[PDB]
Amino acid sequence: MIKVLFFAQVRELVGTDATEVAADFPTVEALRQHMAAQSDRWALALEDGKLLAAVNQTLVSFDHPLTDGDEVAFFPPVTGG
Amino acid sequence: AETKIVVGPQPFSVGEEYPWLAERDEDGAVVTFTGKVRVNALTLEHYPGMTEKALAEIVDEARNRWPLGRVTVIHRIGELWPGDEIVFVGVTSAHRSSAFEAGQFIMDYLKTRAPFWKREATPEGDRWVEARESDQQAAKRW
Ligand SMILES: [Cl-]
Ligand SMILES: [Cl-]
Ligand SMILES: [Cl-]
């Protein structure tokens, strides 16, 4: 399967820290669209123009391909330092 | 040509980190940056499986852009208060220009790519700190 993690405001709005999805999506963007379509709260959390994505702990474009066993994360602009 | 990367709640001491950073005779120019929390407490949420990896990937890119010697990057997590030290970046090179430029680059990329989020405990409740457009523009110049 594919494991999906959420952080900060995104985590708060989707209402869970982590979930699993079958490996039936060609890219990060296709997965994002599928998850946004689950509810009005999930759409608000995941349709933001500034949303960031990581695959296997590296920042990537939303066009990045997906593979069975990957860890994907969705989160807002960062504020460290 | 070693690199030290640390992410954790413990305080750090510039006096304890400097001797290792500056030890090699070939590393003739040494630059450090320390950033502090800028009265409400802050808490730092983070992505544990990625914070050390993201910092290492920024230093790897810096090493391909400039000829660097020893490098150290430390970032804290947990509850912190105004005046507490949150981040340390130490870089070395043969000449000052490369050491200063690499220090600036590492901080600009850390502030736009490393997965940390600040939340402030105000009198009316917790509030997420806002990301700044000035940090986006600073990072885009590299
Ligand atoms: Cl869609
Ligand atoms: Cl700053
Ligand atoms: Cl600068």
Swiss-Prot record, chain A:
Q: Enumerate the InterPro entries for this protein.
A: Beta-grasp_dom_sf, MOCS2A, Mopterin_synth/thiamin_S_b, ThiS/MoaD-like
Its post-translational modification remark reads: C-terminal thiocarboxylation occurs in 2 steps, it is first acyl-adenylated (-COAMP) by MoeB, then thiocarboxylated (-COSH) by IscS.
Keywords attached to this entry: Isopeptide bond, Molybdenum cofactor biosynthesis, Nucleotide-binding, Phosphoprotein
Q: In the record, what terms sit under GO molecular function?
A: nucleotide binding
Glycyl adenylate found at: G81
Name its pathway: Cofactor biosynthesis; molybdopterin biosynthesis
- Coiled-coil region(s): none
Can you locate the Glycyl lysine isopeptide (Gly-Lys) (interchain with K-119 in MoaE) cross-link?
G81
Its GO biological process annotations read:
Mo-molybdopterin cofactor biosynthetic process
Task: Please list the residues that carry the modification 1-thioglycine.
Answer: G81
Q: What SUPFAM superfamilies is this protein classified in?
A: MoaD/ThiS (SSF54285)
Tell me what induces its expression: By anaerobiosis, repressed by the molybdenum cofactor.
Q: A single GO CC term, please?
A: molybdopterin adenylyltransferase complex
Its domain of life? Answer: Bacteria
Give the miscellaneous note: The cross-link is not seen in all structures of the MoaE-MoaD complex.
Give the PANTHER family listed for this entry. MOLYBDOPTERIN SYNTHASE SULFUR CARRIER SUBUNIT (PTHR33359:SF1)
Query: Which protein family is it in?
Result: Belongs to the MoaD family.
Query: What does the function comment of this entry state?
Result: Involved in sulfur transfer in the conversion of molybdopterin precursor Z to molybdopterin.
Description of how the protein assembles with itself and partners? Heterotetramer of 2 MoaD subunits and 2 MoaE subunits. Forms a stable heterotetrameric complex of 2 MoaD and 2 MoeB during adenylation of MoaD by MoeB. During catalysis MoaD shuttles between the two heterotetrameric complexes.
Question: What is this protein's record name?
Answer: Molybdopterin synthase sulfur carrier subunit
From Swiss-Prot, chain B:
EC number assigned by the record: 2.8.1.12
Q: State what changing E120K does.
A: 17-fold lower activity than wild-type
Annotated effect of mutating R132A = 2-fold lower activity than wild-type
Which BP terms from GO are recorded?
Answer: Mo-molybdopterin cofactor biosynthetic process
Q: Name one Pfam family in it.
A: MoaE
* Matches recorded under SUPFAM superfamilies: Molybdopterin synthase subunit MoaE
Instruction: Provide GO CC annotations from the record.
Output: cytosol; molybdopterin synthase complex
Q: What would changing F33A do, according to UniProt?
A: 4-fold lower activity than wild-type
What pairs make up the disulfide bonds? none
UniProt binding sites for substrate:
K36, V37, R38, H95, R96, K111, K118, R119, E120
Q: In the UniProt entry for this protein, what further remark is given in the free-text comments?
A: The cross-link is not seen in all structures of the MoaE-MoaD complex.
Outline what the protein does.
Answer: Converts molybdopterin precursor Z to molybdopterin. This requires the incorporation of two sulfur atoms into precursor Z to generate a dithiolene group. The sulfur is provided by MoaD.
This chain belongs to which protein, by name?
Molybdopterin synthase catalytic subunit
Its taxonomic placement starts with: Bacteria, Pseudomonadati, Pseudomonadota, Gammaproteobacteria, Enterobacterales
Q: Which gene encodes it?
A: moaE
